From a paper:
To examine the heme-binding potential of HphA, acid-acetone extraction was used to strip the co-purifying heme. The resulting apo protein is devoid of heme and refolds to its native conformation as indicated by the absence of a Soret signature in the UV–Vis spectra and X-ray crystal structures. Apo HphA also crystallized in a C2221 space group, with three monomers in the asymmetric unit. All apo HphA chains adopt an open conformation and do not show structural heterogeneity in the heme-binding region. Comparison of holo and apo structures reveals that the loop containing H43 undergoes a large conformational change upon heme binding and release, while the 310 helix containing H106 is only slightly displaced. Size exclusion chromatography-multi-angle light scattering (SEC-MALS) confirmed that HphA exists as a monomer in solution, regardless of the presence of heme. Apo HphA interacts specifically with hemoglobin conjugated to agarose beads as evidenced by pull-down. Based on the pull-down results, we propose that apo HphA binds to Hb largely through its heme-Fe coordination residues, H43 and H106. This mode of binding is plausible as the loop containing H43 is flexible and could wedge itself into the heme-binding site, positioning HphA to capture spontaneously released heme using H106 in a relatively quick step. The loop containing H43 then dissociates from Hb and clamps down on heme in a relatively slower binding step.
Numbering used by the authors: 22 to 264
């Protein structure tokens, strides 16, 4: 019941954890090089709890309002964590409201989001997903790009009948200051989309973006995805709530 992608499965895998309330499982992430239990699939919900549990030492878990929508953001830096959790790595990830939709990034202890280990991912429950075949909807979108405190944000427009997803995000303190979808599309009535993207920011314009994501929930109440660029500083994960 869980779908999702990781830009680098040698660092991060996305998958399902068993749960008494979800026969298809709950969204989870596995850190390939971490100590137990974090090398198994760990529910994002448990990582949310860890971010709360270590908040006095530098982690955080915050409800952030974007437009009229809430995104729950978890920030887990290696510097805030005990030494045996060094191999757990650095996390920034968000949840689309209380929907079972997560999106975020990771990088290795001692690296930065500019390093090759900068990995982006999304994960979500597909059990109830239905995608309209006609009409249009907009989504309030938040994006994570090397920060848990300065989110990308903007509006994506889904044209369900044409099968297109369009829009632009901007940032106020991340590597990426603007990111535009280019030709991102999906078969009408189906959940998965993909296309290209262009970003601008601290390293200049980068037209090499590749976008992959999907709709989630009844009547496509959410979306999430990732964008990868030749410059991994610009690698971005995003999640949207249907307006």
């Amino acid at each position: 019941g869980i779908d999702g992608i990781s830009s680098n499965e040698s660092n991060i895998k996305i998958g399902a954890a068993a749960n008494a309330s979800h026969p298809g499982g709950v969204a989870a992430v596995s850190v390939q090089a971490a100590g137990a239990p974090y090398n198994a699939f760990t529910g994002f919900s448990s990582l949310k709890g860890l971010a709360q549990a270590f908040a006095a030492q530098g982690t955080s878990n915050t409800n952030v309002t974007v437009g009229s929508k809430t995104f729950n953001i978890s920030h887990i830096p290696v510097s805030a964590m005990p030494p045996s959790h060094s191999a757990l790595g650095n996390f920034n990830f968000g949840q689309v409201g209380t929907q079972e939709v997560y999106f975020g990034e990771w990088w290795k202890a001692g690296d930065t989001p500019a390093s090759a280990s900068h990995t982006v991912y999304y994960a979500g429950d597909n059990t109830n997903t239905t995608v309209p075949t006609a009409g249009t909807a907009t989504y309030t979108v938040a994006g994570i790009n090397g920060s848990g405190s300065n989110l990308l944000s903007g509006t994506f427009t889904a044209n369900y009948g044409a099968g297109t997803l369009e829009g632009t995000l901007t940032g106020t303190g991340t590597a990426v200051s603007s990111l535009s979808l280019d030709g991102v599309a999906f078969n009408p009535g189906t959940a998965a989309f993909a296309g290209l993207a262009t970003a601008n920011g601290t390293a200049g314009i980068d037209n090499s973006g590749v976008v992959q994501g999907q709709f989630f929930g009844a009547n496509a109440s959410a979306l999430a995805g990732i964008a990868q660029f030749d410059n991994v500083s610009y690698n971005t994960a995003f999640g949207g709530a249907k307006n």
